[PDB]
Amino acid sequence: SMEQVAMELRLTELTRLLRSVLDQLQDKDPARIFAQPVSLKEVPDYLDHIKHPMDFATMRKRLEAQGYKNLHEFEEDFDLIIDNCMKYNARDTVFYRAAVRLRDQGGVVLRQARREVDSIG
Secondary structure, eight states, rough: OHHHHHHHHHHHHHHHHHHHHHHHHHHTTOOOSSSOOOOOOTSTTTHHHHHSSSHHHHHHHHHHTTTOOSSHHHHHHHHHHHHHHHHOOOOOOOHHHHHHHHHHHHHHHHHHHHHHHHHHO
């Protein structure tokens, strides 16, 4: 149907905007701490601690499959990156501190993304 196509165009455009958001957030992680999945070879107990691991590469795979239907779903995955790190790692660590900085800096990007998503529909 033409309606299904229009819906698909909307999803494609959301995907375009979320790709730009993802790029801007990942620039706030210049150490690449959150770039890839925590390695279960290197942290073999990780899944005993963290039940839903997340990282920027995994988000990008979902994004490119158009697997985010709305901004809320995308934000959920970004918050997992931060929140998983802040639980596994202690306050005095470069990992925790990186997550705090990513959260604080990302907030600004996400505030305007929400306005854009609502504005453009």
